[PDB]
Structures are given as structure tokens and as C-alpha cells.
A paper describes a structure:
We also obtained cryo‐EM structure for J033, a member of the J038 lineage antibodies. The structure at 4.75 Å resolution showed a very similar binding mode to that of J038. Among them, two (J033 and J038) of three most evolved and related antibodies showed broadest neutralization activities (70.6% and 76.5%, respectively). Initial negative stain EM indicated that one Fab of J033 or J038 bound to each of the Env apex. In contrast, J038 and J033, which had short CDR H3, bound to the V2‐apex without penetrating into the apex hole in a similar manner to VRC38.
Author numbering:
A (entry chain N), C (entry chain B), D (entry chain M): 519 to 556, 564 to 661
B (entry chain A): 31 to 136, 136A, 137 to 188, 190 to 309, 312 to 321, 321A, 322 to 355, 357 to 405, ...
E (entry chain F): 191 to 243
């Protein structure tokens, strides 16, 4: 098994079996402890910076949840929807991707159309539900 | 059997003990009076008019005093409120100069309305005319003021005095527009936690409780401060309770809680006059100018027979923890001013009431009744203006003079005791108790003795017969 | 009909139909109000504890969501996955558990096998979902 | 074709087709950036006024997430529960509602029944799967 | 003579580094709140605005 970020350089396919370890560590941390011992410990410089950490912790988790909340499969690790490729964001075939290209490098290639990917993905989830309302 | 599969729940009623942080929640009606109070300032969230007292019957939880974490948070809160309530106010650093005092001569009244016939206030105050600068720092002027003897000490060279505090700290005077009125405070936990209240009547201090009642948050808590006797407390309902983690141990205090109240009646019958003298740029000082008219030491009146009845009851209750001993009371045996006194603040003025004759008794077997008729008990009480409510954690403070007449009644709940050591054969089957003592925390542990913060863990888990369907 | 936390001492089987009462009061309390009435009230020591109070409310509720999110039972009250229960944590039968032992005692009874179980659920969810991608 | 709050004045029927555009902007905002240049930079009033802004953003959004979680509609822009309208809250026929009854004043008409609809929906979700936990 | 305000309260001398020039400010609400702006021209104190954006 692998630990935190234990396969960031491994191939696409072999890095698809270590997703669960990183999902868990996205909020768990030592910041939960208030202080070793609680003058004015509330406004102490070591206290004002710690509070900033806790707020940044939830906002970083909430950011991912909100996007994954809208895409219609909240509460799952892996998930596929019904948006077919236009095949111009990445014109590479299957085995050429999942075998020998890596995750870190792959994001750079597609990082140029994500703002046009997140929006189009959300509309599909909304579109599916509209057809369902007038179905039954 | 083979069909046992995990079935996660959500919202299970399961709690585990922990420690959290609370916040003030003042009463709606008791707030918004343009008072600018110290404890329950305007920053408190309005309370819930309809608190829920949800009765979890069929259960048991282990409470504990002397370890309830809530006392520390609210003690720190009181300290912080007291400290920040003095920051906007003015300092008193130009006053640390030598004084040229003189004992008082005045053409005051002689009728004195001598009903108390205890004593007029000669030698209790000193006419001291000191000499400090005006707004322009190059000019100094002579101004006279009246100070109590407790605020004045002599270093050397008799007929030349000085302020007491000027070798330990500087005491900012209270801003005259803020009062010390004890407003009820409701401590409420953030959503996600809960507060458990042991609803038993005859609740002894520690140990399991089998009648737990849960509330969203506690009722009003009086932030009143006192030294030798509890003031305006919450009476117990069952009977008189004697609270101690180790009655055998004498290293700590003993909290006595009553179920029948006793009313105290203490007042200051003489006027002081408020005269303001500038000290520098934008800084003003309020001094007792010159007393006129009635002159009498501030005294407290207490129904004697009620005191005798309460003493009989508490002696009867302590008669079971000391089955054969003889119980008697004695005045405080010495130490600093607060313990050797009764300390309580009313209407922006601090009092130090002797209260010696309240602790002079010896109960042997309750064989003979202390049959006497109703005579009110009158006890002297000094007045101090350079206050130090805490040793070194708080800020030394100088209450401004208050003019007119001060008359407030308190209505007493709790008494602080302390056992005394001894030998096995040397003792004459006798144990003596002395009142006084106890820190500020000992006052609050007599009120927060029913609540314990808990944290909810709504993640339940238990085997069932499910099997999640597969997708083809 | 019960109150909040009003059946913790009751038997588990008869306390399995009042969970919505507890689940409905994880955030909805009194802290949502800003102040009774508005010189920089945001820095008063009374006003500096709401920040500790407010961020503790969310940071305690999110931890619940994170575990519910991964297990696939997100967006439900009484869910149930398909991971076997080999009885090494508790081998008592169906009736010996549900009807007689209360909730608090049961939570304490397996409090030392939780961390192993909490890791088992997520892995069961993840590898199950890998089948779906390897199914179509 | 409509921006933020674009169709808030339009009729009931044509307003639903712009629900997504008013949903992507519940957390994203100007607060993501740090500052013009990072005295009392962390203790200035805007050093705490900004912090008060961040904590209200997550709390206000995530409060809505709580109600979506219980009802089972998690991860769905449009949901479909099973609470039968009993005509007591409002007995306008379906034509009279979706034709020219605009959104902003719609639920103000139902405003005396929010405190009970938000409770009866929770029960309906609870009763659905209690039958399911003893059916599988 | 003496200063008029040296006796009533305390007075400070502003450091020359800080400038009193009013720089334009844009007030902006946290995410989850909208600002309504009436673009009607002849709009007095109150009254409904039917041109708000
Ligand atoms: C245990 O519980 C016991 C039961 O409650 C409790 O006993 C009660 O204690 C409270 C203490 O607050 C008592 O209430 C006070 O009573 C005061 C009596 O004052 C006498 O002398 C005055 C002259 O100085 C007279 O004017 C006055 O006549 C009238 O005064 C009141 C008018 O409403 C009224 O209460 C009186 O009965 C009488 O009708 C009386 O003869 C009273 O003065 C005091 O009022 C202050 O507090 C009010 C509430 O905040 C304010 O609304 C009011 O304006 C007063 O505040 C002013 O003074 C404060 C400093 O003292 C300032 O902080 C305020 O800002 C305000 O300041 C203005 O006025 C100043 C001049 O006074 C001026 O200098 C300032 O610049 C500013 O302009 C209050 O009502 C109550 O009576 C007690 N109960 C009984 C039965 O007697 C006991 O205290 C508890 N134990 C402990 C330890 O606390
Ligand atoms: C409270 O009042 C009591 C009186 O009821 C005070 O007790 C008396 O205090 C004075 C001095 O303050 C004592 O005077 C001298 O005391 C010494 C002590 O050894 C004694 O030997 C002398 O003969 C002289 O009397 C007095 O004895 C003492 N007791 C009585 C019955 O008067 C008490 O001091 C007051 N409280 C405080 C804090 O002062
Ligand atoms: C306290 O001392 C002051 C002065 O130290 C006394 O004030 C004096 O009063 C007499 C009587 O009219 C005046 O002639 C003096 O000029 C005053 N001295 C001043 C203003 O410095 C005051 O009477 C004394 N009060 C008491 C009660 O002894
Ligand atoms: C306030 O002014 C009086 C009047 O001058 C001072 O009293 C005398 O001050 C001189 C000046 O040093 C001394 O030499 C005298 O010894 C003082 N008189 C006495 C009887 O001691 C007074 O000292 C001034 N106030 C203070 C605090 O010094
Ligand atoms: C737990 O304590 C409560 C006290 O709040 C008891 O409830 C009271 O019982 C007495 C019995 O005579 C009634 O007169 C009161 O009306 C009850 N309510 C209150 C608010 O006092 C309760 O009985 C105790 N538990 C048990 C098992 O007896
Ligand atoms: C207040 O508490 C005292 C004792 O703490 C109660 O006095 C006892 O009352 C019970 C029941 O009335 C008697 O059986 C005892 O004999 C009393 N004690 C003594 C020493 O005589 C008193 O009754 C309580 N007050 C109220 C109103 O209930
Ligand atoms: C508290 O004490 C004061 C004075 O010690 C009491 O005031 C007296 O009240 C009686 C009757 O009301 C009058 O006859 C006296 O003239 C008052 N004396 C003074 C000095 O004011 C007051 O009544 C006491 N409080 C209570 C509730 O009894
Ligand atoms: C002090 O308290 C006692 C009782 O605690 C009071 O005595 C009672 O007084 C009422 C009316 O004055 C009588 O009806 C009772 O019969 C009395 N009972 C006893 C046991 O004496 C006494 O009056 C109080 N003192 C004052 C000054 O009010
Ligand atoms: C002070 O002690 C007395 C002793 O009884 C309390 O007086 C009673 O208070 C309740 C609450 O309003 C009233 O219903 C009673 O009528 C009062 N007694 C009398 C004889 O009238 C008083 O409550 C105590 N002080 C506080 C702040 O609770
Ligand atoms: C506390 O636990 C006991 C233990 O069983 C409960 O007693 C049962 O209560 C139910 C309630 O209707 C009865 O039908 C049973 O006959 C009782 N006895 C047994 C052996 O089950 C009691 O009800 C519980 N109390 C609460 C409030 O849950
Ligand atoms: C505001 O109401 C007017 C009512 O006339 C709407 O105008 C009509 O809109 C519908 C649907 O868009 C068309 O079918 C009609 O032909 C329009 N008629 C006229 C006279 O304009 C208008 O669209 C509404 N505002 C918005 C933003 O939709
Ligand atoms: C500061 O000084 C000014 C003037 O030197 C004071 O203003 C005058 O004060 C006198 C009283 O001493 C009044 O009779 C005048 O009417 C005031 N002037 C005006 C224009 O009204 C001021 O009061 C002083 N303030 C302090 C705090 O010392
Ligand atoms: C590819 O995506 C772009 C948007 O980034 C879209 O405009 C285009 O139509 C897509 N390609 C095809 C063939 O539809
Ligand atoms: C996969 O990429 C590596 C270099 O990263 C390359 O050597 C290899 O030939 C690639 N595979 C194919 C099939 O092109
Ligand atoms: C003040 O009182 C004391 C004690 O009674 C006395 O010795 C002194 O002489 C008095 N003051 C004056 C100025 O005499
Ligand atoms: C009052 O004070 C004076 C001193 O000013 C003193 O001589 C007298 O004994 C005191 N008592 C009476 C009743 O006058
Ligand atoms: C508390 O008092 C009860 C009353 O009988 C007694 O049984 C118990 O031993 C006491 N507990 C402690 C810890 O002192
Ligand atoms: C106390 O009140 C005023 C304030 O100084 C005073 O004039 C009056 O004479 C005194 N009261 C009495 C009853 O003499
Ligand atoms: C209370 O008892 C003491 C002695 O036990 C007695 O001296 C006193 O007079 C009693 N109280 C009253 C008001 O008589
Ligand atoms: C009360 O008076 C003195 C105070 O110390 C003390 O010696 C005495 O024993 C006590 N009791 C009586 C009845 O005087
Ligand atoms: C009080 O003392 C005794 C005992 O009760 C009694 O004889 C006496 O007359 C009483 N005093 C008065 C003034 O009634
Ligand atoms: C469960 O295990 C314990 C010891 O591991 C054993 O004593 C008990 O009989 C077992 N019960 C069942 C039902 O298997
Ligand atoms: C129920 O549990 C209690 C202890 O919690 C036990 O004494 C009793 O035998 C149990 N009964 C059954 C039927 O399991
Ligand atoms: C878990 O740890 C505790 C702590 O010592 C231990 O006593 C216990 O046997 C372990 N297992 C269980 C099931 O509690
Ligand atoms: C039962 O499950 C636990 C997981 O906590 C595991 O440690 C243990 O080895 C399992 N037993 C068997 C026989 O697989
Ligand atoms: C419909 O449901 C509401 C729930 O708030 C209830 O008040 C009303 O009485 C119900 N009407 C009918 C006819 O059931
Ligand atoms: C339908 O609603 C209207 C207005 O709310 C009311 O006047 C009418 O009586 C209702 N009809 C029925 C059958 O309830
Ligand atoms: C409505 O607001 C727009 C905003 O640009 C403005 O141009 C227009 O003149 C206003 N009035 C009308 C009738 O559109």
C-alpha cells in the first residue's frame, strides 16, 4: 500500500488504486487541538494564526465539495457522467494516456479548458433532472 | 447469522465527555437599558426566551465538582471583563506624591440621630491636603481632599503620609458612567455540544447522578463577588447541603448551601460630596470633598433569630459527618483583609464588614434551646476606595466617590467554612470552624455544580441484515 | 414523539425511530445571531468567543460529513452498506444487541475497534466502485 | 441568456431554466484573493472584518446543505420527494401556479408553512428507508 | 496664552507619512449576498424602483 501522495509520479492506471488514502487526510490534522494551555491567549500571535488555519481548512474542503455537489454524484470516490468528449481538449487515445503519462503532467495539458469543462459538466446534471421531472 | 452486515446510522443519541468554549447570552428584558455594565455588556447574543428542559430519565451519568472545567473559562472571562473595563479610564500616576495630612476638624451636626449609638466617623477619615500640578505642567497648586485611613500609609517622618498603592502598582479609577450591577448571565454552548444538568434535589457534591436533565444552555448566573458569605445565590431545594471532596482533609474550603434564605440589611447613612479636580491634560479626579450632615459608620442589620435558626440547622447537618464531636465557631484567625472581613461591592462602593459577633457560639448536644427574643444584630463596616479584588492577576482599581445615601439589601444564600486540624487524644471531642477564606473560584463552584459540557457523536454503527444492491 | 437527546437511556431497538430529532439540531442553534445591537464590538472579549464558537460549530459538523461522504451513505439518515461483520468486534446475536443493550453502552463496548472499521468502510466503497468502471 | 438573478422577475415556468447560474456563485467571490499587499496588517479592522466575511460565507451556504442532506436530495439541483400536498397550504391549481405566479412572491405566500414543511419532509425521508432497512 | 485643546483632552500630531487624500473605495459583500442598485434617474428618498439592476 501507499501513504500520502505515495504515487504522484506513478502512471495514470497504477495511480487509480490509491485514491482513498488521500481523500481521508483532507481535513484530519493536528490543528484540532485548541492549545497546550489556555496573558490574552485568545489574541496571542500564536492564536490568531492558528484560527486562520482552521478557516482555510474548511474553505478548501468546501470548495471541492461544492463542485462535486453540483455534478450529481455527491458521496462517491469515482464517478462518470454523460458528457461525451469533443476530442479537442485532448486528442490522445486510451492506452497512450493510462499507461505512461502521469497525473501531474496530465493536468497541465488539460488545465487550459477547465473553466469550459466545469461549466459544461454542471449543465448536463441539470439537463438530466429537467427531463426527469416531466417524465413521471 | 451469516447475514450480519454493518449499518451506519446518523443522529444516534450518544455523547462523550469533553471540554469546549462557551459564550454570554444576556436576558432580553435585562438588557438595553443604556447602563454600560461591566459583565453583561451589549455584546452578548440575546437569549432564547423558551429554553428546553428535556428529561432524559432512564439513564445515569457521573458528575463531578472540583474538576468542572466550566469554572476556569468563566473565571478568565470575568478577569478579562474587569481588565478591559478599566482600559478606557484614566490613570492615577500623578498622585504618588507625599501628603501633609491632618486629623479632622469640622463644624458638623451633633444630634447625629443617635439610634445606632455605635460611633461617629472621627479618626476613620483623614483630611489630607496634597499638592499636584494643573493642566500646564510648569505650575502646581494645592488641593485638599478627604481619604479613608485604609488608603493611606506612612513611610517615615510622621505628619507626612502617602497613598498605599504607590509601591506596588498604579490603580486606574473607575469611569463614573459604568456600574457594577450584577446582571444575570446565561452561558450557552455552541451548536453541536450540550449541557447536562443533574436534577436531583439532595445532590451531594460528587459521584453519580441518576436524574439527569438536559438543556440547551444554563439559566442566569449572578456574577456577584464576595469573600466570606455568598450573596444573591441560588438556594437548594432539598435541604442544607455540605459540599466537600474530602471532609477528612482540611487543606481546602467547605461550601455550605442553605435552603432557607437570610436577608442582610447594610447601608451607609452619611453623605459624601463629589468635587472634581483636574490633574493634567484632559485628566480629571473625583474626590470626597467634605462630609456634611449625618455622620455614622456604615452598618449592617441582620435578623438575629433567623441567624440562630440557620446555625442550629447547619450544626444539625454537620452532626452526622462528625458523629460525636463538639462543634463551635470562631472569628477569622488572621491574614489579609478580605478573609478577616466580609467583602461585598454595592452601588459602586466596596465594603469591609467586621461580622465578628456572628460566629461566637458553641453547640454541645442540642439539649437546651437558645431561647431569646428578637434583637437585630448590628455590625460595623469600614469603607475602602483603593480596591484590589485580586492579588496579582487583576488590575488595582479605585472606585470613584458616590454621593448621597447608599442603601441596598442582600439576601444571603451560602457560607464558607474551613476545618481545623488536631490530634487524637489532645482534642476534647471538639472541632472548631472558622469562616472566611476561599478564592473567587470557590464562590462560583457553589453555582456551576450541576452542569457538565458534553459533545455529541451522532455516528452510530451496529450490525443489521442489509445488503446494498448491486448495479448491473 | 421525543425531545432532543430524549431517549439516550432507552433501549437501542426502541431508540432507532427518533434519530431525526438529534440530527435536526447540529447547526440550528442561537449562535447565528450577530449581536444584540451594533466602538468595534468585534474585538470585545465577549465578542471574540463567537468566532471560537462559530468555527467550532462547522468544524464539528464537517467531520460528520466527511465520513458520510466517502462511505456512499451521504445524503441519508439510516443507511447500510454491504461490508461483512466477522463478529470479532462483537459476536453477540441479533436479539441480544438491538432490544436490550442501550446506545451509550454499545458505543463504549466497541470503542477500541472503531479505527479499524472506519478504514474498512471507505475501502469497501472504493473497490466496489472500481468494479463499476471495470463493468461497462 | 440570463446573468445573476436574471430571471428573478420572470414567471414561474421560464424561471427554472436558469437555476444553475444562480447556484455557481454561493461560495466563489472576491474573498479568494489575499490582499493588495500582505500598521497591524492582521489586526486592522479589515484584518478582522475580512475574517468575519469568510466565516459568514461558509456558514450561510452550508446551512442550506444541511436541509438537502436530510431530505435525501443531496447532489441534485432538482429533487423529487414523496410528501403529498394536502391542498391546505395553498389550493391554487397547477395551471394557476406555474403560468404567471412569479418566484419572489411565491414562497412568501407559503411563508407560514416553512416551519412545518421543513419538518414533515424529514419524517418522510425517515419513514422511507426504515421500511427499506427491513426489506433487503 | 495656552493651547485651546491642551486642557480639555489629549492631542496628537499626525505623522506626515500618512496622507489624507481620499482614495476611492468599493464596498463588496461576502459571497451569498447581493447588492441591489436602483438605476432610475428621478428617484427620491424612498418608494418602489422599477429599474433596479
Ligand atoms: C442582590 O440583589 C438585590 C435585589 O435586587 C440588590 O439590591 C438592589 O441593588 C440595586 C443596585 O443597582 C438597587 O438599584 C439602584 O438603586 C439606586 C438607589 O439610589 C438612591 O440614591 C440616588 C442618588 O444617588 C437617588 O437618585 C435614588 O432615587 C431613585 O433612583 C432610582 C431611579 O430609578 C431608583 O432605583 C430609586 O429607588 C429611586 O427611585 C435612590 O434614592 C439607584 O440610584 C440606582 O439607579 C442607577 O442604576 C439604574 C440602573 O442601571 C440607572 O437607570 C440609574 O440611572 C442609576 O445609574 C446611574 O448611576 C450609576 C452609578 O451609580 C451609573 O453607572 C449610571 O450610568 C447612571 O449614572 C447617571 O447618573 C449618575 C448619578 O446617579 C451620574 O453621576 C452619571 O453621570 C449619569 O448621569 C439603582 O436603581 C436596588 O434598589 C436594590 N434593591 C433594593 C430593594 O433596594 C443587591 O444590590 C444585590 N447584591 C449585590 C451585591 O449587587
Ligand atoms: C471586630 O470586632 C471585634 C470586637 O467585637 C474586634 O476584636 C477586638 O479587637 C481589638 C483590636 O482590634 C482587641 O483589642 C486588643 O486586642 C488584644 C489582642 O491580644 C488584647 O490582648 C487587648 O487586651 C486589646 O483588647 C480586642 O481584644 C478584640 N476583642 C474584643 C472582644 O474586643 C475585632 O478586631 C474586629 N475586627 C477587626 C478586623 O478588627
Ligand atoms: C481640610 O483641609 C482643608 C485645607 O487643607 C480645609 O479647607 C480650609 O478651610 C478654611 C475654612 O474656610 C479656609 O479658610 C482655608 O482656606 C481652607 N484651605 C484650603 C482651601 O486650602 C478644610 O476645611 C479641611 N476640612 C476638614 C473637614 O478638616
Ligand atoms: C505644595 O506646596 C507647599 C507650599 O510651598 C509645599 O510646602 C513646603 O514646600 C517647600 C518647597 O520644597 C518645602 O521646603 C517645605 O518644607 C514645605 N512645607 C512643609 C511644612 O514641609 C509642599 O511641599 C508642596 N507639595 C509637595 C508634595 O511638596
Ligand atoms: C427528578 O427530579 C425532578 C425534579 O425536577 C422530579 O420531578 C418532580 O417530582 C416531584 C415529585 O413529588 C413533583 O412534585 C414535581 O412536580 C416534579 N417536577 C419538578 C419540576 O419538580 C422527578 O420526579 C425526579 N425523578 C424521579 C425518578 O423521581
Ligand atoms: C430546609 O432544610 C432544612 C434542613 O436542611 C429542613 O429542616 C428539616 O426538615 C425536615 C422536613 O421538614 C425535618 O424532618 C428535619 O427534622 C428538619 N431538620 C432539623 C434539623 O430539624 C427544612 O424543612 C427545609 N425547609 C423547607 C421549607 O423544606
Ligand atoms: C435596610 O436598612 C435601611 C437603614 O439601615 C432601612 O431604612 C430604614 O427603614 C425604616 C423603615 O422603612 C425607616 O423607619 C428608617 O428611617 C430607615 N432608615 C434609614 C437610615 O434609611 C431599610 O428599610 C432596610 N431595608 C429593609 C428591606 O428593611
Ligand atoms: C426574624 O425571623 C423570625 C423567624 O425567622 C421572625 O419571627 C416570626 O415573626 C412572625 C411575624 O413577625 C411571627 O408570625 C412568627 O410567629 C415568628 N416566629 C418566630 C419563630 O419567632 C421575626 O419576626 C423576624 N424579625 C423581624 C425583625 O422581622
Ligand atoms: C432574596 O431572598 C428572598 C428570600 O425569600 C427572595 O424573596 C422571594 O423572591 C421570589 C422571587 O420573586 C418571590 O416570589 C417571593 O415573594 C420573595 N419573597 C417574599 C417574602 O416576597 C428573593 O427572591 C431573593 N433574591 C433573589 C434575587 O432571588
Ligand atoms: C427504562 O428501561 C426499562 C428496561 O426495560 C424499560 O422498561 C420497559 O418499558 C416498556 C415501555 O413501554 C414496557 O413496555 C416494558 O414492559 C418495560 N419492561 C421491560 C422489561 O421491557 C423502561 O420503559 C425504560 N424507560 C424509558 C423511558 O425508556
Ligand atoms: C415581464 O412581463 C412581460 C409581460 O408582457 C413579459 O413580456 C412577455 O414575455 C413573454 C415571455 O418572455 C412573451 O411570450 C411575450 O410575448 C412578452 N410580451 C410582451 C408584451 O413583452 C416579459 O418577458 C417579462 N420579463 C421577463 C424578464 O421575462
Ligand atoms: C480649557 O480652557 C478653556 C479656555 O481657557 C475653557 O473654556 C472656557 O472655560 C471657562 C471656565 O473656566 C468658561 O467660563 C468659558 O466660557 C470657556 N470658554 C468658552 C469659549 O466657552 C475650557 O472650559 C477649559 N477646559 C478644561 C477641561 O479645562
Ligand atoms: C469543444 O469544446 C468547445 C468549448 O471549449 C466547444 O465550443 C466545441 O463545440 C467543442 N467541440 C465540439 C466538436 O463540439
Ligand atoms: C509513453 O510515454 C513514454 C514517455 O513518457 C514513452 O517512452 C512511451 O513510448 C509512451 N508510450 C507510447 C505507447 O507511446
Ligand atoms: C487625631 O486623633 C488622634 C487619635 O485620637 C489624636 O492623637 C490626634 O491628636 C488627632 N489629631 C489632632 C490634630 O490632634
Ligand atoms: C464625634 O466625633 C467627635 C470628634 O469630631 C468626638 O469628640 C465625639 O466623641 C464623637 N461622638 C459624639 C457622640 O459626639
Ligand atoms: C454524597 O452524599 C451521599 C448521601 O448519602 C453519600 O451516600 C455519598 O457517599 C457522598 N459522596 C461523596 C463522594 O462524598
Ligand atoms: C444628605 O443629602 C444632601 C446632600 O449633601 C445634604 O444636603 C443633606 O443635608 C443630607 N441629608 C440630610 C437628611 O441631612
Ligand atoms: C443566638 O445564640 C447566641 C448563643 O448561642 C445568643 O447569645 C444570641 O443571643 C442568639 N441570638 C439572638 C438573636 O438572641
Ligand atoms: C465571642 O467573643 C470573643 C471573640 O473573640 C470570644 O472569645 C468568645 O468566646 C465568643 N463567644 C462569646 C459567648 O463571647
Ligand atoms: C427579652 O428577654 C427576656 C426573655 O425573652 C424577656 O423576659 C424580656 O422581657 C424580653 N425583653 C423585652 C424588652 O421584651
Ligand atoms: C464471543 O466471544 C467470547 C470470547 O471471544 C465468547 O466467550 C462468547 O461465547 C462468544 N459468543 C458468541 C455468541 O459467539
Ligand atoms: C439484557 O442485558 C442485561 C445487562 O445489560 C442482562 O442482565 C440480561 O440478561 C440481558 N437479557 C437478554 C435477554 O439479553
Ligand atoms: C481497548 O483498549 C482498552 C484500553 O486498555 C483495553 O482495556 C481493551 O481491552 C481494548 N479492547 C476493548 C474491546 O475495549
Ligand atoms: C475480522 O475483521 C478484523 C477487522 O478489524 C480483522 O482484524 C480480523 O483479522 C478479521 N478476522 C478474520 C478471521 O478475517
Ligand atoms: C396539511 O398539512 C399541514 C401541515 O402543516 C397541516 O397543518 C394541515 O392540517 C394538513 N391538512 C390536511 C387536510 O391534512
Ligand atoms: C382555494 O383557494 C381560495 C383562495 O385561497 C379559496 O377562496 C377557496 O375556498 C379554495 N378552495 C377550496 C376548495 O379550498
Ligand atoms: C432601466 O435601466 C437601464 C440600465 O442601464 C437604463 O439604461 C434604462 O434607461 C432604464 N429605463 C428603462 C425604461 O429601460
Amino acid at each position: 500500500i501507499f501513504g500520502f501522495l505515495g504515487a504522484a509520479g506513478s502512471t495514470m492506471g497504477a495511480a487509480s488504486n490509491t485514491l482513498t488514502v488521500q481523500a481521508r487526510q483532507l481535513l484530519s490534522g493536528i490543528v484540532q487541538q485548541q492549545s497546550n494551555l489556555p496573558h490574552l491567549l485568545q489574541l496571542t500571535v500564536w492564536g490568531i494564526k492558528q484560527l486562520q488555519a482552521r478557516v482555510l481548512a474548511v474553505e478548501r474542503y468546501l470548495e471541492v465539495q461544492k463542485f462535486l455537489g453540483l455534478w450529481g454524484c455527491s458521496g462517491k470516490i469515482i464517478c462518470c457522467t454523460a458528457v461525451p468528449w469533443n476530442s479537442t481538449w485532448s486528442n490522445k487515445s486510451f492506452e497512450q494516456i493510462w499507461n505512461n503519462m502521469t497525473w501531474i503532467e496530465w493536468e497541465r495539458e488539460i488545465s487550459n479548458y477547465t473553466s469550459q469543462i466545469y461549466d459544461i459538466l454542471t449543465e448536463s446534471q441539470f439537463q438530466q433532472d429537467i427531463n426527469e421531472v416531466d417524465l413521471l | 447469522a451469516e447475514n450480519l452486515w454493518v449499518t451506519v446510522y446518523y443522529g444516534v443519541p450518544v455523547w462523550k465527555d469533553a471540554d469546549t468554549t462557551l459564550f454570554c447570552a444576556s436576558d432580553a428584558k435585562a438588557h438595553e437599558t443604556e447602563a454600560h455594565n461591566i459583565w453583561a455588556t451589549h455584546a452578548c447574543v440575546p437569549t432564547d426566551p423558551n429554553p428546553q428542559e428535556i428529561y432524559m430519565e432512564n439513564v445515569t451519568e457521573n458528575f463531578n465538582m472540583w474538576k468542572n472545567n466550566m469554572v476556569e473559562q468563566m473565571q478568565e472571562d470575568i478577569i478579562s471583563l474587569w481588565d478591559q473595563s478599566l482600559k478606557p479610564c484614566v490613570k492615577l500616576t500623578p498622585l504618588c506624591v507625599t501628603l501633609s495630612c491632618t486629623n479632622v476638624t469640622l463644624t458638623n451636626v451633633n444630634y447625629t440621630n443617635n439610634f445606632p449609638n455605635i460611633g461617629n466617623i472621627t479618626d476613620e477619615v483623614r483630611n489630607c491636603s496634597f499638592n499636584v500640578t494643573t493642566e500646564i505642567r510648569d505650575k502646581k497648586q494645592k488641593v485638599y481632599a478627604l481619604f479613608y485611613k485604609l488608603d493611606i500609609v506612612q513611610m517615615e517622618n510622621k505628619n507626612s503620609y502617602r497613598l498605599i498603592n504607590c509601591n506596588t502598582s498604579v490603580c486606574k479609577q473607575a469611569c463614573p458612567k459604568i456600574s457594577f450591577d450584577p446582571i444575570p448571565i446565561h452561558y450557552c454552548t455552541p451548536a453541536g455540544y450540550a449541557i447536562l444538568k443533574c436534577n436531583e434535589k439532595n445532590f451531594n457534591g460528587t459521584g453519580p447522578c441518576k436524574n439527569v436533565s438536559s438543556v440547551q444552555c444554563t439559566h442566569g448566573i449572578k456574577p456577584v463577588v464576595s469573600t466570606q458569605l455568598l450573596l444573591n445565590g441560588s438556594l437548594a431545594e432539598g435541604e442544607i447541603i455540605i459540599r466537600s471532596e474530602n471532609l477528612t482533609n482540611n487543606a481546602k474550603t467547605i461550601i455550605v448551601h442553605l435552603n432557607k434564605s437570610v436577608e442582610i440589611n447594610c447601608t451607609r447613612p452619611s453623605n459624601n460630596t463629589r468635587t472634581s479636580v483636574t490633574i493634567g491634560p484632559g485628566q480629571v479626579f473625583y474626590r470626597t470633598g467634605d462630609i456634611i450632615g449625618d455622620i455614622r459608620k456604615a452598618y449592617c442589620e441582620i435578623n438575629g433569630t433567623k441567624w440562630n435558626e440557620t446555625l442550629k440547622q447547619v450544626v444539625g447537618k454537620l452532626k452526622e459527618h462528625f458523629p460525636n464531636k463538639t462543634i463551635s465557631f470562631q472569628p477569622p484567625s488572621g491574614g489579609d483583609l478580605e478573609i478577616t472581613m466580609h467583602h461585598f461591592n454595592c452601588r459602586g462602593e466596596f465594603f469591609y464588614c467586621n461580622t465578628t459577633q456572628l460566629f461566637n457560639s458553641t453547640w454541645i448536644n442540642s439539649t437546651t434551646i437558645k431561647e431569646y427574643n428578637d434583637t437585630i444584630i448590628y455590625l460595623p463596616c469600614k469603607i475602602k476606595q483603593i480596591i484590589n479584588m485580586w492579588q496579582g492577576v487583576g488590575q488595582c482599581m479605585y472606585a470613584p466617590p458616590i454621593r448621597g445615601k447608599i442603601n441596598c439589601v442582600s439576601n444571603i444564600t451560602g457560607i464558607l467554612l474551613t476545618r481545623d486540624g488536631g490530634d487524637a487524644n489532645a482534642t476534647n471531642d471538639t472541632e472548631t470552624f472558622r469562616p472566611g477564606g476561599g478564592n473567587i473560584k470557590d464562590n462560583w463552584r457553589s453555582e456551576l455544580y450541576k452542569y457538565k459540557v458534553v459533545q455529541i457523536e451522532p455516528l452510530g454503527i451496529a450490525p443489521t441484515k442489509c445488503k446494498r444492491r448491486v448495479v448491473e
